Amino acid sequence: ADLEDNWETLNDNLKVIEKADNAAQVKDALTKMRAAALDAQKATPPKLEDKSPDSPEMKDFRHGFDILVGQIDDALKLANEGKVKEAQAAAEQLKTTRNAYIQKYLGDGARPSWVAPALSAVLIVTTAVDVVGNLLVILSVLRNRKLRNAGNLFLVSLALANLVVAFYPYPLILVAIFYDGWAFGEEHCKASAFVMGLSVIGSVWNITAIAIDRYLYICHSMAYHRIYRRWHTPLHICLIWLLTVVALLPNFFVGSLEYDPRIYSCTFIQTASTQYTAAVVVIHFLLPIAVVSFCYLRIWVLVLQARMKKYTCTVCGYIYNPEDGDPDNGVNPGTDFKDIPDDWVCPLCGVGKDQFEEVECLKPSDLRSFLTMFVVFVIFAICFAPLNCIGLAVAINPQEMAPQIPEGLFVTSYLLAYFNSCLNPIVYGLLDQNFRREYKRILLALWN
Ligand SMILES: CCC(=O)NCC[C@@H]1CCc2ccc3c(c21)CCO3
Ligand SMILES: [Zn+2]
């Protein structure tokens, strides 16, 4: 057997020990991994093919292999006794000495020169804008009480999902570019991928929970106020985050959280299990996009039919807001002007509905800022649409569609997925006039 085929063999049996149940399954995997380690030792590397068999370049690899074999001897003594958790720890210790020592004259490192300066620039820009912008969102919602109670408590949850990915995984990815390879341990590798999982899936379900809250506030607005919202929304934020952790646990069993050299980041692997990836593309993308697309379609048909809209008085300038109503004149909050009985008159000048003109302009701050949150969703869809397509193609047939996907296309798609983390406060400033004022309020306070 060739050295290239043996490099895969002992690496494939190492993944078996991680998903093993008893010590006999570990002992059977350690026997195959030791025979492959002896075989790869009695083979010249393709990279150092020019280097002589006695010369000091190939002589260091021959002495380096015996260090890894002795580590299997220490691991098999634990496996004979019946220790699985102790032998799995010894297997991870041999895995670190198999990518640092053994991977010297081995590797298909044919990555184009543009992936390193782009990824890193995107990563610097994203991490810098995220830690500042999303922090200002947290600050503006915690300060402004009128904005917080306007269903923007979910924004704290979404901004924390965006922030957490900039503090732990993004900087480690940047170190993995400059040092060329994952410079941190396997425990730091699996965790970085998991943190990114919470940030991605958590953002999907936070956007959907917002689409439901903004669907119920415009459509079935009467029913909305009848149902409590005091303690309901902090409970929903807790539930959607626990659902995310539950959805991320099968990664620990399948073993899909490993280092990807293509994008220099320790992330989720699409080829590990085509059954679990299919569930991530459908249940955690295709389905939640479909329920949100319906939510905003029902809102847009109301705006198009000129339904829930502000009506201003052509006598004393009284602006009737459907979100406010007219409670002292019987109009309970959340009532459309087209539904108020014809006997109703202005509660300021007493002129009838006859002389009432609507605002033929929808502002992005109106109806709990429905337009901004819509833009937020469309932006999210754009960033994660190609990556979910790659994961969909591999799930169908990985035997022919996995090598068919270009390496350049994967980096281009993963660059967008990362960049989404800093884009959310940018759209709050440009579209939401109330957030814009609050951004200036905090920035002027930090100055003076
Ligand atoms: C289409 C499949 C895909 O590429 N999905 C996004 C990869 C994201 C981001 C990192 C991470 C970690 C764990 C995890 C997931 C991800 C999906 C479910 O478990
Ligand atoms: Zn009036």
Task: Compute the C-alpha angle 210/303/301, nearest 5°.
Answer: 80
Beta strands in 237-345 (DSSP E): 257-260, 265-268, 311-313, 319-320
* 391 Cα nearest atom in ligand 1: 1
Please state, in angstroms and rounded to a whole number, the distance separating the CA atoms of residues 166 and 129. Answer: 10
> Of 386, 405, 422, whose CA–CA distance to 126 is shortest?
422
For ligand 1, whether the C-beta of 251 sits within 6 Å is yes
Distance CA 204, CA 372 (A): 16
Other CB atoms within 10 Å distance of the CB of residue 246: 9
3-state helix, strand, coil in the chain (%, to 5): 70, 5, 30
Nearby residues for ligand 2 (ion, Cβ within 5 Å): 313, 315-316, 318, 346, 348-349
Question: Token digits for 145?
Answer: 């009480």
Closest to 150 in 3D by CA, of 365, 363, 423: 365
Q: Show Cβ contacts of residue 223 under 8 Å, excluding neighbours closer than 6 positions.
A: 216
Enter the tokens of residue 381. Answer: 């869809």
Please, which contacts does 209-213 make with residues 24 or more away whose CB atoms are closer than 8 Å?
209/154, 209/236, 209/237, 209/240, 210/151, 210/154, 210/158, 210/373, 211/291, 211/292, 211/295, 211/296, 211/373, 211/377, 212/295, 213/151, 213/154, 213/368
Could you list the residue range(s) of the whole structural domain that residue 349 is in?
302-358
* CB of 280 shorter than 6 A to ligand 1: yes
Token pair belonging to 69: 């074999």
Which residue's alpha carbon is nearest to atom 15 within ligand 1? 197
d(Cα 26, Cα 17) in Å, to the nearest integer? 5
Among residues 426, 428, 308, which one has the least CA distance to residue 367? 308
Q: Measured between alpha carbons, how far is 110 from 402 in angstroms, rounded to an integer?
A: 17
Which residue type is seen at 13? N
Task: Indicate if the alpha-carbon torsion angle 408, 409, 414, 416 is positive or negative.
Answer: positive
Query: Is there an atom of ligand 1 within 6 Å of 270 CB?
Result: yes
Determine the Cα–Cα distance for residues 419 and 238; give it in Å rounded to an integer: 26
Going by the DSSP 8-state scheme, the letter that residue 353 receives in this structure is G
Tokens of 331: 């109009």
DSSP 3-state of 318: coil
Tell which residues of the chain come right before a gap with C–N over 2.5 A: none
Please check whether residue 199 is in contact with residue 282, taking contact to mean a CB–CB distance below 8 angstroms. no
Task: Tell which one of 200, 248, 263, 413 to mutate to probe ligand 1, the residue whose CB is within 8 A of the most ligand atoms.
Answer: 200
Token couple for 296? 């905003």
Burial class (CB in 10 A: 0-12, 13-18, 19+), 343: exposed
Q: From atom 11 of ligand 1, which residue's Cα is the shortest distance away?
A: 197
**What CA–CA distance (Å, rounded) separates 120 from 74?**
40
**With 0-12 CB in 10 A as exposed, 13-18 as middle and 19+ as buried, what is 335?**
buried
Most ligand 1 atoms within 8 A of CB, residue of 243, 280, 413, 416 to mutate: 280
Q: Give the strand pairing for 257-260 and 311-313.
A: unpaired
In order, the DSSP letters of 265-276 are: EEEE-SSS-HHH
Q: Strand pairing of 319-320 and 311-313?
A: antiparallel
Q: What whole-number distance in Å separates Cα of residue 240 and Cα of residue 205?
A: 6
Here the CATH number for the domain that contains residue 311 is 2.20.28.10
Q: What is the CA radius of gyration of the chain?
A: 29
| Amino acid at site 188 | H
CATH code assigned at 80: 1.20.120.10
What is the whole-number distance in angstroms between the Cα of residue 354 and the centre of ligand 2?
11
CB of residue 388 inside a 6 A radius of ligand 1: yes
Q: Return the closest-CA partner of residue 424 out of 158, 40, 74, 103.
A: 158
Looking at the DSSP assignment, which residues form a beta bridge with residue 311? 320, 358
CA 135 to CA 10: how far, in whole Å? Answer: 46
* Look-up of token digits 């408590």: 153
The answer to whether the CB of 420 is under 6 A from ligand 1 is: no
User: From the CA of 340, how far away is ligand 2's center (Å)?
Assistant: 16
196 lines ligand 1 (CB under 6 A): yes
Among 173, 194, 252, 267, residue to substitute to test ligand 1 (most atoms within 8 Å of Cβ): 267
* Cα–Cα nearest to 277, from 417, 405, 392: 392
Q: β-strands 319-320, 356-358: how paired?
A: unpaired
Give me the DSSP letters along 148-213.
HTTTTTHHHHHHHHHHHHHHTHHHHHHHHHHTTS--S-HHHHHHHHHHHHHHHHHHHHHHHHHHHH
3-state secondary structure of 357: strand
**What number of H helices and E strands is found in the chain?**
18, 5
DSSP 84-121: SHHHHHHHHHHHHTTTTTSTTS-------TTHHHHHHH
Q: Please give the number of the atom of ligand 1 that sits closest to the Cα of 276.
A: 18
Contact 45, 6 (CB under 8 A): no
C-alpha span between 274 and 282 (Å, rounded): 12
Burial of 413 (0-12, 13-18, 19+ CB in 10 A): buried
Distance CA 172, CA 109 (A): 20
Q: Which two tokens stand for residue 133?
A: 């912008």
